[PDB]
């Protein structure tokens, strides 16, 4: 389902990296997480010498973060899978809810 | 050089070129390809602002910037070249107009550029674009001053670039564009010197790609006059064969002897008598393009051709011609 | 009838660890059961439960506090909305987090906190990226009815790091706990009571602990925010891509936001495994160095003495011609510290193929052994060294190289009572460090079980001993290390089901290397050898190359290699390649290209295939996979990315032994911490950290 | 047991894998083998090297970096060592 | 009377000439602020460079800037 | 067009439909883009060859038959002279990738 | 300055940080002052609320205007 | 709803909503034969096809949502018929029921590549004539891939390069805590 969909053949043997965006560890708010992305790397960005803004060149500089965010790794690398990309995917690191209570900073260092 | 992108159109190519000759025939093929490489050009124009407004496409937003200037006055020279690395000569006439003489445009000019590119030191690769067989002692006054040219641009700056380029064939040309349009004197087209000449022609696509592969080459081609000939060395008569093919016509030549052309010729070479009047610019009769259409020099020696630069002309026979399609 | 119900997942796929699933409390989140182990706080019980309750100051890795109540669910049968953060789930316990009372004593709250605070949204720099405007878009009221005078407080000056703007700042405490625990320092403070409430030090004082610069991360506010990121960018600009670091050796987790071409802003990612939430100052904020002093085009030396930028052509032909007119036993490959797997397995198998083994890692001093992996890993996990009873960190400084060690030894000597001890040059640790002997005489001590510290070591259950490889430098390793081993050995450290025997690195590519045998064999190389390759090792003592050299620096930026470099070969960065990287503990990560390359460097890999097939030696691979199973082949370690692969083989192999120097003792292997590679000696922010000392 | 292992090879790389059911002989030659081989050759990198799932190989670096791979997928501990034996007399 | 132009109009007066305001330039010129207050420029597009309006990168301009990020070695 | 294609026999069928169809109109693809005299009605129908065998290895029916739709589209938009005929003239080893790019 | 050296290249008309270190700045009575920007609450920036306990003058964030303590 | 009781169960196949406008979620063998119900019915006359929505979830399985709207004139009532087609499924088309469906499939098959079974003259509509990819769907990039025009010596035309401009700048807005 590569060929039938239209895209161009050098970007069907383009190097993806199916991740899980981590929380941004800015604000302690799991609203983001779980929604699995294609990431074509897509690293080539220029500055457009006229003015100070950049210049991608690659087609699938965006599209990665944007508006294609799979439910689940399945998903994703059925996708990335179809298209004929080469997905690595890269596992989320998930935390551990250790047991932690309150009554635990008045602990009694004994005498 | 100093190249950041991927391919052209807004990529940068550390060659802000200043191609002197750009709002020409040759000039919208090779400021093409500066610009679609992505390197900026700085486009020297001459007179009506409407002579580079066709390059102010084909270049991404100031990758192509056409700028004004005199030819025979400098400080304007050396403001087009101020933020330069590159700089093309494209400058030129196949006839002489009662302002500019041969050479005060083919001559004085080229050696003026190269001049005022050795003192703006910085100019990494200076291209020459003369005619190829401009060597002294041709007939054409054209040619002699374009020899001319070249041993004052490699005299007052060494490692320049010299293209030979041949008569140059494409829209809007000076060699095919002629022709036609005097075909439409019924058929009649008038080869001159009964087609004897032996020139090869080159489409002017592969003229331009041969300019900037010069660039692109590492720090050979430089000082090395080369001569962009191309394929298939011709006959003036069995070129004409060729557009008959693309413009739908029944070939009707005639055979025209040099002095019956001088001859013909002998009016429009009056330009420094007639001042208050500018003659309609010779095209097919110009008494210095048939003294360089007597000699056959103008076929491809042993120096440098198109194999130089990894590049193989195109042929003359379909896309490369097919500009005749719009004189069916 | 027969419905369809969400599956009710964790709040972020949250591990939940039951310490034996006997005591698994059964709570009614919403009417919806959750098992959670005993002792989870009714907001974890949620998080168990999918629901996400808005939370100001409860950090799972920090202290459980109430100086806010933005929490505050409804439990069944109390008067008052408990706090969530700090009530411990009982059996039984009906939580519900949406009823009335909960939403209002959420907006409630979220209108006190938004009472005193100052409108900065737009000049605040986490604008965007704020759990209180987040919380407030969220949970709190769409409308103030204060309007008064808001309280303002002056801005505290906490140093080169962390831009101040205490007035935004909403008291939750949870950066005077962060610098108190995890940091370790204790410097901030909440100053005052009442509204007049000032977080930080009460004297003007620099933050001057690494591992501080994290607080940004934990404050939920702006108040406390880069000062390096100033304000150049926005929460929404921002392309992040999940590389890791190369600073440290501690391998530790990041996040690359770049915006465009240049990296704006390197902010750490949740890895519980390597480094929990928390980056060292040198891996925030050496992001300015990939900016500054690049290379960016390759310059070979000319009939004068200064670089001129030839192409590539030229400067890989140069460099193959003198090559092939060299010795080959006088080729030697010192390979970076920031380099990657690849790029030195590429430089093993091009400086061999041509006829030498002189290529070994910046760091690696005379005869490392390699063999063993345990030899140069932190056996024992980064985090596993949270189960240790008592630690020996011989030398090593951990707070100064592989800052996350520390930060994970710190939390361990917190949150369970346990003691190390420091045999190693006079330090400043974080936490009670009992400096055991500067000397390795101090070591025999312990060896010979002649130390008042060999009992404690013995009756600790679960024991660690930190080895840094900063002294491998030293003549006698082997003795050192063999005295290591007897310490293992005689304490049951390296047991079956704990190895309690780690030594730590300092360089990233380190553990790379001596993965992949680039072992310096001995002296004599680097000496009488006339291709030194250079590949990015800016710590290389260049006193030592013979002044006839032919030095080709292959670096990204050169700060004393590239003044000997007689031809310059311009590399790309951490972040603008997919490098394999091996940290301490054996997790293989592998960085993510952000930013493109600057100019007109290249791969280190592709720069070191390409010399060789310039320079006539045909190699096999001609791509990253390519080179990866190479990899497989040399060290099949590092192509199980993101997989420890613990080292199953004790010291019971190393052959035997030697005797300790009693002189030299143990020498500090990082000065600075602050200018430790290339990248961070060139930025414009840990240049000026010198203040922070 | 060789001796002259340093003198001929350049290094020796085993990539047994950790706790596999297959590889397990190529544990037992090292575990059994490693001190003594060390011991006689004091300077060789004799890489061990460990995975999860890697077929257990035994590399050898001779001089001009050419390679020899034998594996050691069903080899017995005297199998093995007679395959390392093999390696160090087809360098020298 | 020749080469006139719009926005020749000035901006005290552009408010009380399209009927956006009912304030002649004789009121607003009391509101102008004095500070960073700058005359008018007619609007020079095309009449030359140096007139004409330049980015800052476009050759043009007399200090065209250089806008790669990383700072050359 | 239903998709008959409830087995790769069909679908093939139908390609081996489309390839006639293909080859049998090429003379009026030649006449209204006059490729006549630089290409070959071999070298055409080589294209199309290759063209319907560079995506012979589909061993789903459904992509087989969607392939065939794009391909009967693209001759459509080629026999009337919706697309131009400048394309058609054009639709008919590390190291040297190294020096040019990082990617 | 140089920050105001990459986007004003005309370099006669001062410089806005200039324009505002030059201004005096404005006494108060409190311990907190307003500044809701020019004059209309409207017109000017959000209210930044600035402290006044230390000696130096405190400049608003979004203004640039310094103020004083003037006890 | 009247219109549930006497639809064949199978044809709701699999789902069916009760707001923000009805739906009848069926599967795309029984789509046509379904708008054959709801039209040339006494209690339920649609007779207007007013929309047909391609929608493309990339998570799915079955990725487009072929999205029929329906309006009906005569009792005064929307219905939204949708279906589900991967992008190699060949999905009835209506065409010969409400003739309006011609140019909203091409549409439909322009945009994401759901082609129509025994429609005539399925051409791609929107798109450029030598368009090739899918707009509409997810995977294909805002800027298109090769979809830069511009003159060049090739004289009176504009060519169809490789795409390169100032980088859409993507901003992530989106907020934790939903
Ligand atoms: N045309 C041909 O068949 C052949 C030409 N060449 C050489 O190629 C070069 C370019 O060819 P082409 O573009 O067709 O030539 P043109 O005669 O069309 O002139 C091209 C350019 O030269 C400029 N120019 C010519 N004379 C002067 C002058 N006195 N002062 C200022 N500018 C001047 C023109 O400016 P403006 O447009 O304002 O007049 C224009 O920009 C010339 O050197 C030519 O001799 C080589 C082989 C044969
Ligand atoms: S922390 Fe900053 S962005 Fe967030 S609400 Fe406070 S002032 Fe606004
Ligand atoms: S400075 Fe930040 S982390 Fe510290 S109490 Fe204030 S808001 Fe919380
Ligand atoms: S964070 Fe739990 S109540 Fe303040
Ligand atoms: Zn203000």
């Not at chain 3, 670096?555 to 301490?584: C, Q």
């Not at chain 5, 330039?25 to 009449?47: A, I, T």
Request: aromatic residues 8%; proline residues 6%.
């Amino acid at each position: 389902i590569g060929k039938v969909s239209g895209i161009p053949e050098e970007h069907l043997s383009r190097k993806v990296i199916i991740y899980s965006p981590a929380r941004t560890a800015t604000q302690s708010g799991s609203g983001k997480l779980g929604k699995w992305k294609i990431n074509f790397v897509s690293t080539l960005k220029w500055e457009n010498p006229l003015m100070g803004w950049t210049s991608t060149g690659d087609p699938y500089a965006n599209v990665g973060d944007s508006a294609l965010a799979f439910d689940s790794e399945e998903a994703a690398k059925s996708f990335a899978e179809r298209h004929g990309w080469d997905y690595k995917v890269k596992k989320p690191n998930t935390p551990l809810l250790k047991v932690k209570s309150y009554s635990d900073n008045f602990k009694w260092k004994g005498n | 050089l100093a190249r950041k992108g991927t391919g052209g159109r807004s990529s940068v190519s550390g060659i802000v070129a200043t191609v002197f000759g750009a709002t020409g025939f040759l000039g919208r093929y090779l400021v093409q390809q500066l610009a679609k490489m992505g390197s900026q050009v700085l486009v020297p124009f001459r007179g009506s602002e409407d002579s580079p407004r066709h390059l102010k496409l084909m270049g991404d937003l100031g990758q192509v910037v056409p700028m004004k200037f005199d030819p025979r006055d400098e400080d304007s020279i050396k403001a087009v070249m101020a933020k330069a690395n590159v700089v093309i000569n494209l400058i030129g006439r196949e006839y002489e107009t009662r302002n500019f003489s041969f050479e005060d445009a083919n001559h004085h000019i080229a050696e003026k550029l190269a001049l005022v590119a050795k003192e703006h030191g910085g100019i990494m690769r200076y291209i020459q674009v003369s005619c190829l067989g401009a060597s002294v002692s041709s007939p054409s006054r054209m040619l002699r001053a374009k020899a001319a040219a070249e041993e004052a641009v490699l005299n007052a700056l060494p490692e320049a670039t010299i293209m030979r380029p041949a008569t140059m064939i494409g829209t809007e040309d000076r060699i095919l564009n002629p022709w036609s349009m005097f075909v439409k004197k019924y058929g009649f087209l008038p080869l001159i010197g009964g087609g004897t000449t032996k020139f090869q022609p080159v489409y002017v696509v592969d003229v331009a790609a041969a300019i900037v592969a010069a660039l692109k080459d590492d720090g050979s081609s430089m000082g090395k006059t080369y001569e962009l000939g191309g394929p298939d060395v011709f006959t003036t008569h069995e070129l004409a064969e060729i557009m008959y093919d693309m413009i739908r016509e029944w070939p009707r030549y005639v055979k025209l002897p040099f002095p019956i052309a001088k001859a013909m010729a002998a009016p429009r070479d009056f330009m420094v008598n007639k001042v208050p009047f500018p003659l309609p610019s010779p095209q097919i009769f110009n008494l210095d393009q048939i003294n360089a259409l007597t000699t056959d020099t103008l076929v491809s020696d042993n120096a440098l051709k198109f194999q130089d630069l990894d590049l193989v002309p195109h042929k003359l026979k379909g896309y490369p011609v097919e500009f005749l399609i719009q004189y069916r | 009838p027969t419905q369809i119900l969400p599956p009710r997942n964790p709040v972020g796929g949250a591990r939940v660890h039951f310490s034996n699933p006997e005591d698994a409390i059964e709570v009614f989140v919403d009417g919806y059961a959750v098992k959670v182990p005993k002792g989870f706080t009714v907001l974890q019980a949620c998080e168990v439960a999918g629901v996400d309750i808005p939370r100001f100051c409860y950090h799972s890795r920090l202290s459980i506090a109430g100086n806010c109540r933005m929490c505050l669910v409804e439990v069944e049968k109390s008067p008052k909305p408990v706090a969530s953060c700090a009530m411990p789930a009982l059996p039984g316990m009906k939580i519900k987090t949406d009823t009335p009372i909960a939403k209002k004593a959420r907006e409630g709250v979220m209108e006190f906190l938004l009472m005193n605070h100052p409108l900065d949204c737009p000049i605040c720099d986490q604008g965007g990226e704020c759990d209180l405007q987040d919380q407030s878009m969220a949970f709190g009221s769409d409308r103030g009815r204060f309007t008064e005078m808001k309280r303002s407080v002056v801005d505290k000056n906490l140093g080169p790091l962390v831009k101040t703007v205490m007035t935004r700042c909403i008291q939750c405490t949870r950066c005077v706990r962060f610098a108190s625990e995890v940091a370790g320092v204790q410097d901030l403070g909440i100053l005052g009571r009442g509204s007049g409430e000032e977080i930080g030090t009460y004297v003007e004082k620099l933050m001057t602990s690494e591992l501080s610069g994290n607080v940004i991360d934990i404050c939920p506010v702006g108040a406390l925010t880069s000062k390096p990121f100033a304000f150049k960018a926005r929460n929404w600009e921002l392309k992040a891509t999940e590389t890791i670091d190369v600073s440290d050796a501690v391998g530790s987790n990041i996040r690359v936001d770049s915006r465009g071409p240049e990296v704006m802003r390197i902010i750490p990612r949740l890895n519980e495994d390597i480094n929990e939430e928390w980056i060292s100052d040198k891996t925030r904020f050496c992001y300015d160095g990939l900016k500054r002093q690049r290379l960016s085009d390759p310059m070979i030396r000319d009939s004068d003495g200064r670089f001129k930028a030839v192409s590539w052509r030229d400067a890989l032909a140069v460099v193959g011609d003198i090559i092939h007119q060299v010795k080959p036993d006088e080729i030697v490959g010192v390979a970076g510290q920031l380099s990657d797997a690849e790029s030195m397995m590429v430089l093993k198998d091009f400086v061999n193929r041509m006829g030498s083994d002189n290529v070994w890692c910046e760091g690696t001093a005379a005869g490392v052994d390699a063999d063993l992996r345990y030899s140069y890993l932190m056996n024992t996990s980064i985090s596993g060294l949270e189960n240790a009873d008592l630690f020996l960190l011989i030398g090593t400084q951990p707070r100064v190289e592989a800052a996350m060690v520390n930060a994970r030894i710190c939390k361990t000597v917190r949150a369970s009572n346990a003691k190390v001890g420091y045999v190693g040059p006079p330090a400043e640790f974080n936490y009670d460090c009992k400096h055991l002997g500067t000397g390795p005489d101090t070591l025999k001590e312990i060896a010979e079980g002649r130390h008042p510290f060999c009992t404690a070591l013995k009756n600790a259950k679960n024991p660690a001993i930190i080895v840094g490889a900063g002294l491998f430098n030293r003549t006698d390793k082997n003795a050192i290390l063999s005295s290591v081993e007897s310490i293992a050995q005689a304490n049951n450290v390296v047991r079956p089901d704990w190895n309690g025997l780690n030594f730590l690195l300092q360089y990233a590519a380190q553990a790379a290397a001596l993965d992949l045998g680039l072992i310096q064999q001995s002296a004599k190389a680097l000496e009488s050898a006339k291709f030194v390759y250079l590949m990015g090792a800016d710590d290389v003592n260049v006193d030592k190359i013979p002044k006839d050299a032919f030095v080709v620096y292959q670096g990204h930026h050169g700060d004393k290699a590239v003044y000997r470099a007689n031809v310059i070969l311009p590399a790309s960065a951490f972040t603008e390649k997919e490098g394999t990287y091996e940290n301490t503990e054996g997790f293989t990560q592998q960085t993510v290209p952000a930013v493109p390359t600057v100019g007109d460097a290249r791969d280190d890999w592709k720069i070191v295939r390409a010399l060789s097939e310039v320079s006539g030696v045909k190699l096999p691979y001609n791509s990253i996979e390519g080179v990866r199973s190479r990899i497989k082949s040399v060290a099949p370690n590092l192509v199980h990315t993101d997989e420890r692969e613990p080292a199953a083989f004790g010291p019971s192999l190393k052959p035997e032994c030697k005797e300790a120097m009693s002189t030299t003792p143990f020498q500090t292997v990082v000065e600075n911490f602050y200018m430790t590679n290339s990248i961070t000696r060139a930025s414009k922010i840990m240049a000026q950290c010198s203040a922070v000392l | 047991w060789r001796g002259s292992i340093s003198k001929s090879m350049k290094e020796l790389r085993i990539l047994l894998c950790q706790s596999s059911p297959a590889s397990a002989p190529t544990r037992t030659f090292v575990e059994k083998n490693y001190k003594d081989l060390k011991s006689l050759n004091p300077k060789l990198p004799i890489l061990i090297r460990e995975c999860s799932g890697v077929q257990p190989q035994m590399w050898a670096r001779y001089d001009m970096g050419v390679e020899r791979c034998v594996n050691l997928d069903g080899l017995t501990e005297p199998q093995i060592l007679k395959a390392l034996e093999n390696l160090v007399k087809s360098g020298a | 009377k020749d080469r006139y132009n719009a926005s020749q109009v000035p901006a005290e007066w552009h408010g009380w000439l399209h009927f956006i305001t009912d304030h002649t330039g004789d009121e607003l010129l009391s509101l102008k602020p004095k500070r960073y207050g700058l005359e008018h420029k007619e609007n020079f597009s095309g009449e030359g460079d140096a007139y004409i309006y330049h980015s800052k990168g476009h050759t043009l301009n007399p200090g065209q800037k250089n806008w790669t990020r990383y700072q050359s070695w | 067009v239903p998709p008959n294609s409830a087995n790769l026999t069909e679908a093939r069928r139908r390609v081996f439909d489309f390839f006639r169809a293909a080859c049998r109109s090429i003379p009026t693809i030649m006449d209204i883009y006059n490729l006549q005299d630089v290409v070959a009605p071999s070298q055409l129908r080589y294209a199309i060859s290759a063209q319907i065998r560079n995506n012979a290895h589909i061993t789903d029916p459904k992509v087989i038959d969607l392939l065939i739709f794009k391909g009967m589209e693209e001759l459509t938009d080629i026999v009337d002279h919706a697309k131009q005929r400048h394309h058609i003239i054009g639709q008919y080893d590390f190291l040297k990738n190294f020096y040019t790019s990082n990617y | 300055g140089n920050h105001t050296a990459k986007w004003m290249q005309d370099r006669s008309k001062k410089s806005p940080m200039e324009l505002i270190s030059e201004v005096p700045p404005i006494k108060v009575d409190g311990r907190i002052v307003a500044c809701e920007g020019d004059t209309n609450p409207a017109l000017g920036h959000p209210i930044e609320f600035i402290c006044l306990d230390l000696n130096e003058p405190a400049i608003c964030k979004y203004c640039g205007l310094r103020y004083v303590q003037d006890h | 709803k009247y219109s549930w009781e006497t639809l064949p169960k199978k044809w709701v196949k699999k789902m069916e909503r009760s707001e923000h406008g009805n739906r009848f979620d069926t599967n795309t063998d029984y789509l046509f034969q379904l708008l054959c119900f709801l039209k040339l019915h006494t209690y339920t006359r649609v007779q207007v096809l007013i929309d047909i929505c391609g929608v493309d979830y990339p998570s799915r399985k079955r990725r487009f949502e072929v999205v029929y709207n329906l309006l009906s004139t005569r009792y005064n009532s929307r219905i939204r018929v949708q279906t589900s087609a991967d992008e190699v499924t060949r999905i009835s088309s209506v065409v010969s029921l409400f003739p309006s469906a011609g140019w909203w499939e091409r549409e439909v098959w322009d945009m994401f590549g759901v082609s129509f079974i025994n429609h005539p003259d399925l051409r791609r509509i929107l798109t450029d004539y030598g368009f090739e990819g899918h707009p509409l769907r997810k995977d294909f990039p805002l800027s298109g891939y090769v979809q830069v025009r511009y003159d060049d010596p090739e004289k009176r035309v504009v060519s169809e390069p490789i795409e390169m401009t100032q980088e859409f700048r993507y901003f992530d807005f989106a907020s934790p805590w939903e």
